[PDB]
Ligand binder design. Structure first.
Ligand SMILES: O=C(O)CCCC(=O)Nc1ccc(/C=C/c2ccccc2)cc1
Lengths: 208, 214
């Protein structure tokens, strides 16, 4: 039993987008299916619902711009969004709220004018002039990328990791990630992998 | 139907139990005897995870340290033996009536022993200076409480202006906090001066831990 949202991405103000939701083990025609969204502030917001009877519901904020529909044959839930406003930017979830709630992983919708920009990665290492002993802290600085979703991974194996929230600067996002390991193993190559799907880009850096 | 929870719990000691309250403006008890209240957890950079539904049922994968009790309007989420991975925000919500509403979330505060931040600074990488631009970075990792102030001294002088700070939420394993402090400046500004100081005053450790380079 899983729900899978699909369709998000970048879109400019006034534009339109169509999200889809498929499922395994859940028969949409039998329930009140819903769409809810998570605004950066982190509080869930109801977007739309459709009953098994086909009656649609919407809060004023989207009343005539969004349309929820269901395909009872193929078992697909739809959310047609029109006249998109920057305030509609969020993670959109598909959900079966009756009884035991179920929702998917969510799909991100960004209503913006700015243009996609891949991230610049700079290896953050000590060098010469400071403390270098047991457990040295290394890191990678990711700068100047727009669509915020970015993923930092260290040699796909490490818990001594610390990834800080991305901060916006000059219309572009910047963040850093640090990792600590015993000096008794620096000569084993440390690599940070920055993945930024909104550009299909993914840079790797070998510290030192 | 409005759901209300406090925004934070009193700090909790590992191994002890935690209580998270919630209430609704209307009874969630339905004529069929079921109470349509469900709870879920929101961890940093993750999708909400269902914990309990229909008031007393555990979702899948949820340990029995979690339990929910209460009437039709007042509820408590109980957590026996709090563990470090339990940190995050807890939401109550209702699925009795169509216009779905959610509580505001209660953040679980983990109380632990005071800890000094492990500071470390780094000079702008060549690659960065190349493309014109220099940012100096320093990390204040694994400290507690999260109360802390950081100051930048370019050549032993007041700076601020171009400094960005970022904090992590309570760590899921150590229950500590970590912070990032970045000073961004033009390749020119950087070249000029040569005495950069990262000063962290942990308001609960004295003797300002500092680092700098030339
Ligand atoms: O007819 C009735 O009994 C009332 C039905 C009410 C209903 O559909 N509820 C309902 C609808 C959507 C949700 C979504 C919850 C959620 C929770 C966490 C993450 C993402 C989504 C939760 C509940």
């Amino acid at each position: 039993a899983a729900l899978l949202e699909s369709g998000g991405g970048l879109v400019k103000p006034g534009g339109s987008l169509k999200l889809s939701c498929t499922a395994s083990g859940i028969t949409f025609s039998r329930y009140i299916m819903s769409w809810v969204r998570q605004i950066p502030e982190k509080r869930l917001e109801w977007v739309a619902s459709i009953s098994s009877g086909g009656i649609t519901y919407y809060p004023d904020s989207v009343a005539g711009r969004f349309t929820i529909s269901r395909d009872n044959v193929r078992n697909i839930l739809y959310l047609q969004m029109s006249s998109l406003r920057s305030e509609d930017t969020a993670l959109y979830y598909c959900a079966r709220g009756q009884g035991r709630p179920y929702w998917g992983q969510g799909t991100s919708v960004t209503v913006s004018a700015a243009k996609t920009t891949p991230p610049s990665v700079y290896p953050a290492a000590p060098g010469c002039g400071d403390t270098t002993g047991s457990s040295v802290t290394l890191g990678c600085l990711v700068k100047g990328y727009f669509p915020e979703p970015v993923t930092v991974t260290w040699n796909s194996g490490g818990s001594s990791v610390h990834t800080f929230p991305a901060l916006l600067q000059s219309g572009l996002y910047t963040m850093s990630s640090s990792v600590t390991v015993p000096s008794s193993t620096w000569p084993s190559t440390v690599t940070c992998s920055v993945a930024h799907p909104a550009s299909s880009t993914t840079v790797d850096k070998k510290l030192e | 139907a409005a759901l209300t929870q406090s925004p934070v719990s009193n700090p909790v000691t590992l191994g002890t139990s935690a209580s998270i309250s919630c209430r609704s403006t209307k009874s969630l008890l339905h004529s069929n005897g079921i109470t349509y209240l469900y709870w879920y957890l929101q961890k940093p950079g993750q999708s909400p995870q269902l914990l309990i539904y229909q008031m007393s049922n555990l979702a899948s994968g949820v340990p029995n340290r979690f339990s929910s009790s209460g009437s039709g309007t007042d509820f408590t989420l109980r957590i026996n033996t709090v563990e470090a991975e339990d940190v995050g925000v807890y939401y109550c919500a209702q699925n009795l009536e169509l216009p779905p509403t959610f509580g505001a979330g209660t953040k679980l505060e983990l109380k632990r022993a005071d800890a000094a931040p492990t500071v470390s600074i780094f000079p702008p990488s060549s690659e960065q200076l190349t493309s014109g631009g220099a940012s100096v970075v320093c990390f204040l990792n694994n400290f507690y409480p999260k109360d802390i102030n950081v100051k930048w001294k370019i050549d032993g002088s007041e700076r601020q202006n171009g400094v960005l700070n970022s904090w992590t939420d309570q760590d899921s394993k150590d229950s500590t906090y970590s912070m990032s402090s970045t000073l961004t400046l033009t390749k020119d500004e950087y070249e000029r001066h040569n005495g950069y100081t990262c000063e962290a005053t942990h308001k609960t450790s004295t003797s300002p831990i500092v680092k700098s380079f030339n």
